[PDB]
Design an enzyme around this catalytic site. Structure first.
Site, PDB file in Angstrom:
ATOM      1  CB  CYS A 387      -0.948   0.007   1.201  1.00 39.30           C
ATOM      2  SG  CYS A 387      -0.135   0.026   2.821  1.00 39.30           S
ATOM      3  NE  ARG A 392      -3.559   1.697   3.021  1.00 36.53           N
ATOM      4  CZ  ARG A 392      -3.671   2.580   2.037  1.00 36.53           C
ATOM      5  NH1 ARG A 392      -4.848   2.794   1.465  1.00 36.53           N
ATOM      6  NH2 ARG A 392      -2.605   3.250   1.623  1.00 36.53           N
TER       7      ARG A 392
END
Ligand SMILES: [Cl-]
Ligand SMILES: [Cl-]
Ligand SMILES: [Cl-]
Ligand SMILES: [Mg+2]
Length: 431
Positions: A387, A392
């Site tokens: 990410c 993430r």
């Protein structure tokens, strides 16, 4: 013969067996997500769900968005709904709730346990590596010294993760747990994992050895992009981020409390506000990193973009993907890595709505699996999730690891490292 909101038709084992392949039938498991994943919460010898069943915990009945949860799961009034739990009584409120919202074909299967679970001819399914994603009851047994399944160790530590926000820990934490700032294991300069020497020292000073069972969790505190450090409020993403780094480093047994701190207080367990001192250990006990294949750096990532059996998986928000925003207040460059497969994380850089339920437990893994497959994200490939800086990406990677996928990694540097080199190509705008 009238519709009865409070009296529900029973479907027999034989009828349900004949319907396992029907496209017009929706089999709904109302137990907790952890039991659905495979935890044998009532001592059943076969854990998991009826093959093809979807997960809709009865715990979610108090959520005001219950009907929107059902609809985004594509459960429609024209479907035949078959509910089951550990007991048919656990299904009654869910059955009524479906009937109150225009679902007229609703049945309750009474014999899931012990009839279905107790005969190997009745097909079941489970999340392959479910024992890495633990329920609150397992953590409570662990810290109480009680016997618990999927645990054969004599050394553990419960770790409350946060990003430079000790108040997330001091305001309430699992009894006996100690806090770990995410900065202990990742560098604020590169936002990558620290060097092996730093990781060894940091883990030792937090009392962790390679043979320690580490149970990680964080506290969700509603991240706000108006704040300077919204990551200070996304504690459970940070916990999974730290779980990735520890597993990369070489902690052999790392668990994540499914749903984080909310799962502990939802279960009604006692919370503590003690500032627990660290019990350091002198030697980590294994070379760091023991599992380097979990981490992918920018040169290998560029190679994976050129390889047929490899892909990078962009786990960013849509405004980041098209170059509307960078996603972070400390990153100016906007754009996306060319050639990566998009797997939208959620609303922004500190939310994972597409991978979580409303209570922050992991989304039903079949749904993740099927959405990923539509984009060619499949276990036969070597996959590097990423990410902005890897938070993430780590949570997406963890979900794939839980499914037992054999070659999944985190491209640690992400968009931050990629865009810091002006010679690197990037795309922008709507594809
Ligand atoms: Cl594993
Ligand atoms: Cl979070
Ligand atoms: Cl990107
Ligand atoms: Mg990084």
């Amino acid at each position: 013969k009238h519709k009865n909101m409070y009296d529900h038709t029973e479907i027999t084992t034989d009828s349900l067996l004949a319907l396992l392949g029907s496209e017009k039938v929706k089999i709904i498991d109302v137990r907790s997500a952890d039991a659905y994943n495979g935890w044998r919460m009532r001592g059943e010898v076969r854990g998991g769900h009826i093959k093809g069943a979807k997960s809709l915990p009865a715990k979610w009945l108090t959520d005001p968005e219950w009907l929107n949860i059902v609809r985004f799961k594509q459960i429609r009034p024209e479907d035949a709904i078959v509910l089951y739990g550990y007991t048919p009584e656990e299904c009654e409120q869910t059955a009524t709730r479906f009937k109150e919202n225009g679902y007229n074909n609703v049945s309750v299967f009474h014999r899931f346990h012990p009839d279905w679970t107790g005969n190997d001819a009745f097909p079941m399914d489970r999340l392959e590596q479910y024992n890495r994603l633990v329920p609150a009851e397992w953590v409570n047994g662990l810290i109480s010294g009680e016997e618990i399944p999927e645990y054969d160790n004599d050394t553990f530590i419960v770790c409350h993760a946060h990003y430079r926000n000790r108040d997330a820990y001091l305001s309430g934490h699992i009894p006996g747990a100690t806090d770990m700032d995410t900065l202990a294991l990742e560098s604020p300069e590169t936002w990558n994992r620290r060097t092996p020497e730093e990781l060894k020292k940091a883990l030792e000073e937090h009392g962790i050895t390679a043979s320690t069972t580490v149970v990680l969790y964080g506290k969700f505190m509603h991240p706000d992009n108006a704040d300077e450090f919204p990551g200070s409020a996304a504690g459970h993403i940070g916990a999974i981020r730290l779980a990735f780094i520890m597993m990369y480093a070489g902690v052999e047994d790392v668990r994540v409390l499914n749903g984080g701190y909310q799962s502990w207080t939802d279960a009604g367990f006692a919370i503590s506000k003690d500032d627990v001192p660290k019990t350091t250990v002198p030697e980590f006990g294994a070379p760091i990193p023991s599992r380097p294949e979990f981490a992918v750096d920018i040169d290998e990532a560029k190679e994976m973009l050129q390889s047929e059996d490899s892909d990078l998986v962009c786990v960013r928000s849509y405004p980041e993907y098209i170059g509307e925003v960078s996603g972070y207040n400390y990153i100016k460059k906007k754009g996306r890595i060319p050639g990566a497969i998009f797997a939208e994380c959620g609303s922004d850089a500190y939310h994972m709505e597409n991978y979580r339920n409303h209570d922050h437990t992991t989304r039903e893994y079949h749904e993740i699996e099927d959405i990923w497959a539509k984009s060619g994200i499949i276990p036969k490939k070597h996959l590097a999730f990423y990410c902005g800086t890897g938070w993430r990406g780590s949570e997406a990677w963890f979900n794939a690891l839980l499914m037992g996928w054999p070659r999944v990694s985190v491209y640690d540097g992400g968009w931050f490292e990629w865009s810091n080199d002006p010679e690197n190509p990037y795309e922008t705008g709507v594809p």
